[PDB]
Design a protein around this motif. Structure first.
Motif, PDB file in Angstrom:
ATOM      1  N   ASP A 127      59.873  18.819  35.658  1.00  0.00           N
ATOM      2  CA  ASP A 127      60.854  19.002  36.717  1.00  0.00           C
ATOM      3  C   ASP A 127      61.362  17.679  37.368  1.00  0.00           C
ATOM      4  O   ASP A 127      60.958  17.362  38.498  1.00  0.00           O
ATOM      5  CB  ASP A 127      60.124  19.916  37.731  1.00  0.00           C
ATOM      6  CG  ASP A 127      60.973  20.359  38.935  1.00  0.00           C
ATOM      7  OD1 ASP A 127      62.220  20.264  38.899  1.00  0.00           O
ATOM      8  OD2 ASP A 127      60.338  20.841  39.937  1.00  0.00           O
ATOM      9  N   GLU A 163      68.306  17.013  43.773  1.00  0.00           N
ATOM     10  CA  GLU A 163      68.292  18.455  43.521  1.00  0.00           C
ATOM     11  C   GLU A 163      67.268  19.132  44.477  1.00  0.00           C
ATOM     12  O   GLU A 163      67.505  20.229  45.010  1.00  0.00           O
ATOM     13  CB  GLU A 163      67.859  18.734  42.094  1.00  0.00           C
ATOM     14  CG  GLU A 163      67.920  20.218  41.710  1.00  0.00           C
ATOM     15  CD  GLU A 163      66.501  20.893  41.714  1.00  0.00           C
ATOM     16  OE1 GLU A 163      65.511  20.318  42.205  1.00  0.00           O
ATOM     17  OE2 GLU A 163      66.386  22.017  41.198  1.00  0.00           O
ATOM     18  N   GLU A 164      66.117  18.474  44.651  1.00  0.00           N
ATOM     19  CA  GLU A 164      65.035  19.033  45.459  1.00  0.00           C
ATOM     20  C   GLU A 164      65.237  19.053  46.988  1.00  0.00           C
ATOM     21  O   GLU A 164      65.933  18.209  47.552  1.00  0.00           O
ATOM     22  CB  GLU A 164      63.745  18.276  45.187  1.00  0.00           C
ATOM     23  CG  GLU A 164      63.339  18.249  43.717  1.00  0.00           C
ATOM     24  CD  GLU A 164      62.670  19.528  43.229  1.00  0.00           C
ATOM     25  OE1 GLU A 164      62.727  20.572  43.934  1.00  0.00           O
ATOM     26  OE2 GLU A 164      62.069  19.492  42.104  1.00  0.00           O
ATOM     27  N   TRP A 291      54.446  24.377  38.300  1.00  0.00           N
ATOM     28  CA  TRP A 291      55.633  24.140  39.144  1.00  0.00           C
ATOM     29  C   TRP A 291      55.293  23.701  40.584  1.00  0.00           C
ATOM     30  O   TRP A 291      54.563  24.381  41.308  1.00  0.00           O
ATOM     31  CB  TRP A 291      56.506  25.423  39.153  1.00  0.00           C
ATOM     32  CG  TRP A 291      57.740  25.399  40.044  1.00  0.00           C
ATOM     33  CD1 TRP A 291      58.998  24.918  39.723  1.00  0.00           C
ATOM     34  CD2 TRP A 291      57.847  25.953  41.348  1.00  0.00           C
ATOM     35  NE1 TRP A 291      59.877  25.172  40.759  1.00  0.00           N
ATOM     36  CE2 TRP A 291      59.191  25.801  41.767  1.00  0.00           C
ATOM     37  CE3 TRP A 291      56.922  26.569  42.221  1.00  0.00           C
ATOM     38  CZ2 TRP A 291      59.641  26.236  43.014  1.00  0.00           C
ATOM     39  CZ3 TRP A 291      57.365  26.994  43.464  1.00  0.00           C
ATOM     40  CH2 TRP A 291      58.713  26.823  43.847  1.00  0.00           C
ATOM     41  N   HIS A 292      55.863  22.569  41.000  1.00  0.00           N
ATOM     42  CA  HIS A 292      55.682  21.991  42.336  1.00  0.00           C
ATOM     43  C   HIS A 292      54.251  21.750  42.787  1.00  0.00           C
ATOM     44  O   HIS A 292      53.941  21.910  43.980  1.00  0.00           O
ATOM     45  CB  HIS A 292      56.440  22.792  43.402  1.00  0.00           C
ATOM     46  CG  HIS A 292      57.930  22.630  43.314  1.00  0.00           C
ATOM     47  ND1 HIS A 292      58.795  23.203  44.208  1.00  0.00           N
ATOM     48  CD2 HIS A 292      58.705  21.995  42.404  1.00  0.00           C
ATOM     49  CE1 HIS A 292      60.045  22.945  43.858  1.00  0.00           C
ATOM     50  NE2 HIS A 292      60.015  22.216  42.764  1.00  0.00           N
TER      51      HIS A 292
END
Ligand SMILES: [Zn+2]
Length: 323
Positions: A127, A163-164, A291-292
């Motif tokens: 990501d 984007e984040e 994810w994250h």
């Protein structure tokens, strides 16, 4: 009034035969991408950070060394954030800038901001360092073919900044670079001198890569107006599979499955989708388990899956461009 912006509706690919598919499979190198394009990006690179600057220089340097005539532009702007005004820089890499239509591949190069935790640093490997490295590997692998472009149609790569969300996702805190770029492209005449068409009218299709690199991804067919292109990806994956050109892959565990998704995933394609640009959103559903979290790292990436996807994407791009 030319009907050129309608050409994308009828555009058909020029399908590669078996011999050409093997050439493409053999021309991409997952190990070179890993060392030369990916690892340098596996660093903290939230907007405004020194890593952001290093990431941007690496991306530009890797594109500048290629033979194809890439034109690099850094789109820098200010935006309000939960932390006050900040500067962001989108990277745009274009072949044939005055060409009326472009097939566009995109990803975000910033990494989500996290304070260090028990000495761990967030580097967002899937990501989206891997999507970024995949775009760079594609430009490298197809360099000789892309050189021939030097259908008024060419290729463009966008690496979005911001984007984040700086905190958790909210409408105003996320997609800084894409909301900015979509509005800017929507108000820029294209081709130069045009009276009533913009750069968005010239975007044939926006292929957004995100959260790629984990094991067993499943990409759903999100939008009816790009569905026929999602089918091309399915066909390509199936034929590369049948030719024995993919690694540790089965059709039961294929990446492009025949299945829709009604919901809305917030990502960089949103500002473009909402201004009428056709989008192929290559994000898996469900998201990578890491994810994250600090575990979205190099160690959790699946090399043969990335390799297979590089092959599918490179065949898709050549076929779209008739190369
Ligand atoms: Zn993210």
């Amino acid at each position: 009034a030319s009907a050129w912006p309608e050409e994308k509706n009828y555009h058909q690919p020029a399908i590669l035969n078996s011999s050409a598919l093997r050439q493409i499979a053999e021309g991409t190198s997952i190990s070179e991408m890993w060392q030369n394009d990916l690892q340098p990006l596996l660093i903290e690179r939230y907007p405004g950070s020194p890593g952001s600057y290093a990431a941007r220089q690496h991306i530009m340097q890797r594109i500048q060394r290629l033979q194809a005539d890439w034109v690099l532009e850094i789109d820098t702007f200010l935006s309000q954030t939960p932390y006050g005004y900040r500067s962001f820089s989108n990277i745009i890499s274009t072949l044939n800038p005055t060409a009326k239509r472009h097939l566009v591949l995109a990803c975000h190069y910033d990494s989500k901001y996290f304070s260090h935790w028990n000495n761990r640093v967030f580097v967002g490997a899937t990501d989206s360092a891997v999507p970024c490295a995949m775009m760079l590997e594609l430009a490298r692998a197809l360099d000789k073919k892309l050189l021939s472009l030097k259908p008024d149609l060419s290729l463009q790569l966008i690496f979005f900044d911001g984007e984040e969300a700086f905190l958790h996702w909210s409408p105003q805190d996320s997609l800084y670079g894409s909301r900015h770029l979509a509005a800017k492209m929507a108000s820029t005449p294209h081709p130069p001198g045009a009276r009533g068409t913009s750069q968005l009218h010239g975007m044939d299709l926006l292929v957004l890569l995100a959260l790629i690199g984990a094991p067993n991804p499943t990409f759903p067919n999100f939008f009816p107006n790009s569905a026929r292109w999602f089918e091309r990806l399915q066909a390509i994956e199936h034929e590369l599979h049948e030719l024995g050109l993919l690694k540790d892959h089965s059709l039961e565990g294929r990446y492009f499955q025949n299945y829709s998704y009604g919901g809305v995933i917030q990502d960089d394609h949103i500002p473009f989708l909402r201004r009428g640009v056709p989008v192929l959103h290559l994000i898996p559903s469900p998201f990578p388990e890491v994810w994250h979290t600090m575990d979205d790292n190099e160690e959790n990436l699946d090399e043969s899956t990335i390799d297979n996807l590089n092959k599918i994407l490179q065949v898709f791009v050549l076929e779209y461009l008739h190369l």
